[PDB]
């Protein structure tokens, strides 16, 4: 069973895709002739190639603009770097893992990535921080809180508030955000949306779209209409931040500025 | 002062032209995106490229039909040759000299509208087909044109029609499609939108979003309202299709059905 590379980060549709490295002169590139064809402008048309010498697989940079980087080390043009199991190869904004031994429908593809927020927030946070750092790509976090949630629980019981939390999560994930966006509950009454690739301005606009849609949605629990609004806070990862909760903390401070300004609104910074 | 290649023989206008080899990823080819773009049919679209490792400059053949030949020796596909002063590099019928010391816009965007050009679309189409095939993912195409465009030009002048094309494309590009969705002018007042990974249902929704937004938008040309609508045709790549123009042809048939069905509508090819 031949060695392979698996896409860790790449354009939509590519993550989890495996390419067997069966021979020398297999090329990673954005040219259609590439055996490892990745439709991404950060790759050169012919970016890097493989050399196979029995069991030894090496990668060679082909004079790429955005470099070939193995485990964080730049490989100079035409130099050959011997690969071993679990090495990471970064070519532009695409990152592969090398497997000494390599391993389909609509549900199987969505399982592959954990689309529509299957994952855990405590896993996804660190993933987003690592991605932002390795790609030098903006990462924004939007936090939301239900206004007057204690009043909802007092008036309709804890099961009423539970219904609202569960229903709000359902609507956001299934109707309002992209399948590769990550949305989760965090603590008692808060929600976190991770937007890898989104700068502050964009994150604010997404947060506001969600705020207005939730405001307009009819929450009916056991035949009774519950008024629901949310307050919103937005932050974008800074260079000095190393834990995702640091981004959350600033987003949460923005949220409570939104709440102390009259609630049912969005604040950025 | 960087190394360069100088054209010794080539098409008229090229001889004596020097191309600095200032970094890696400089490609010789007949594709417009090539840094060393030579308009000669004997060159491959991407023929050869350079690799720079400090003061060492090498050339790499990219599987070219007519070969990359350095001082009479053929360089096999994907192999490199370290260059030295006065080496001659022959790529098809064009010959360069390498000099250890030597002495335009590639965006492919329409001047009026800022959409991608027809030439860009002609390159992007094969890429979209390859992506659909390797990912086993739907590919959809939406095509449209402005209804009664001749009447707009007659009534408001050619600058009025120009305003409409430019404004319509501003709305589409900046408000209605994703930044990685590919939108191009395809002759005249026809436009093509490529939707990677999008089934028919999605493509129809995008087509309708565009049609409805344009219908409702105020095209105000020197204080006066121009009524603007578009007719839309939509198709989705079928399993047996191998060229993007096959998908285009079916979308264009749907567009003509839109025109014959009253205009200002979307038709999804049945
Ligand atoms: N206002 C706004 N809402 C957004 C945006 N991005 C995502 N959403 C919302 O989030 C829903 C799901 O997004 P999706 O998973 O990417 O799933 C989408 C996506 O795969 C596709 N799609 C829709 N519009 C476009 C488009 O313009 N370009 C491309 N490439 N795909 C689109 O169709 C799916 C369903 O689309 P919708 O029914 O509209 O359902 C959208 C839409 O309600 C945005 O940029 N602006
Ligand atoms: N990760 C993430 N980002 C979001 C989302 N919603 C909005 N955005 C981001 O916010 C930008 C502007 O959103 P827009 O005003 O709705 O303006 C959008 C919208 O009018 C339209 N559109 C694009 N995708 C969709 C979609 O899935 N559904 C609908 N109904 N419209 C879409 O095309 C415009 C430009 O789209 P983009 O270039 O992608 O630019 C988007 C995109 O970067 C979201 O749910 N998830
Ligand atoms: Cl390139
Ligand atoms: Cl290249
Ligand atoms: Cl973390
Ligand atoms: Cl060619
Ligand atoms: Cl017409």
Numbering used by the authors:
A (entry chain A): 32 to 134, 144 to 309
B (entry chain B): 32 to 134, 144 to 310
From the publication, what sentences describe this entry?
B. bacteriovorus is an obligate bacterial predator of other Gram-negative bacteria, exploiting adaptations that allow consumption from inside the prey cell periplasm. The DgcB protein appends the C-terminal GGDEF enzymatic domain with an N-terminal forkhead-associated (FHA) domain, known to be used (in other proteins) for interactions with phosphopeptide ligands. DgcB comprised a ~30aa tail, 100aa FHA, 20aa linker and 160aa GGDEF domain. We provide the molecular basis for initiation of c-di-GMP production, demonstrating that the stimulus is a phosphopeptide tail present on the DgcB GGDEF synthase itself.
Distance constraints guided the assignment of FHA domains to their respective GGDEF partners, revealing a unique conformation for each chain. This arrangement is best described as a pseudosymmetrical GGDEF dimer, appended to two FHA domains that are asymmetrically orientated; the net effect is to place the FHA domains closer to GGDEF chain B. The dimer is stabilized by two molecules of c-di-GMP (classically intercalating via their planar bases), bound at the I-site of both monomers. The bound c-di-GMP arises from co-purification, as a result of (basally) active DgcB. The bound c-di-GMP dimer at the DgcB I-site is orientated in line with the two-fold axis of the GGDEF dimer, complexed by R218 and D221 of the conserved RxxD motif. The interactions of DgcB with the c-di-GMP ligand provide the major contact between the two GGDEF domains; direct protein:protein contacts are limited to just one weak interaction involving the partially ordered linker region. A putative N-terminal tail preceding the FHA domain (residues 1–31) is present on our construct but presumed disordered in this structure. Examination of the pocket reveals that the putative phosphate site is occupied by a bound ion in chain B, and that of chain A is partially occluded by residue D56. The vast majority of contacts to the GGDEF dimer are made by the chain A FHA domain; these comprises both polar (D70 and K48 to chain B) and non-polar (I40 and I126 to chain A, Y45 and Y68 to chain B) interactions. The conformation we observe likely represents a feedback-inhibited state wherein the GGDEF domain has been locked by the c-di-GMP product into a non-productive conformation; we posit that this represents a form present after entry of prey. Hence, most GGDEF proteins do not adopt this orientation as it would lead to steric clashes of the appended sensory domains, but in DgcB this conformation is enabled by having the chain B FHA domain offset.
